[PDB]
Amino acid sequence: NTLRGLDVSRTGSGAQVVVTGTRPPTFTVFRLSGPERLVVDLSSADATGIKGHHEGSGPVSGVVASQFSDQRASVGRVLLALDKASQYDVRADGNRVVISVDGTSQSV
């Protein structure tokens, strides 16, 4: 597999989404509106997270995942419907890709 685990840490200051994988992931993150959404596209690996979204995540209303094929390769799209406006921050560390969804406060 490429993606081996997927974790969501809902908290009031920021919700963290973690995607763990066997190789460093190429990704792109972007926004959509009507409804407010955050979208992550993952290459080589298609990471799908589901049923991990708690009914009390202050940020994430829900998460849908789908993979599409490009030749023998696969692109996975993760879609997070939101409860409030976010400023996402994404960083990689080893085989983990971290996305933290902050509200409107970016630095203390």
Give the number of C-alpha atoms closer than 13 A to the C-alpha of residue 104, restricted to the C-beta side.
Answer: 2
d(CA 6, CA 73): 21
Residue in 86, 63, 87, 45 with CA at minimum distance from that of residue 8: 63
d(CA 86, CA 72): 35
d(CA 106, CA 8): 20
Q: Is 52 left (phi over 0), alpha (psi -120 to 50) or beta?
A: alpha
Residue in 87, 67, 93, 69 with CA at minimum distance from that of residue 79: 67
Q: Which residue has the tokens 């298609």?
A: 46
Computed from CA positions of residues 106, 108, 27, 77, in that sequence, does the dihedral angle turn out positive or negative? negative
DSSP 59: S
- CA distances, 16 to each of 19, 44, 52, 73 (Å): 10, 22, 12, 28
Q: Are 63 and 77 in contact (CB under 8 A)?
A: no
Technique behind the model: cryo-EM
**76 three-state secondary structure:** strand
Token reading at 44: 């080589």
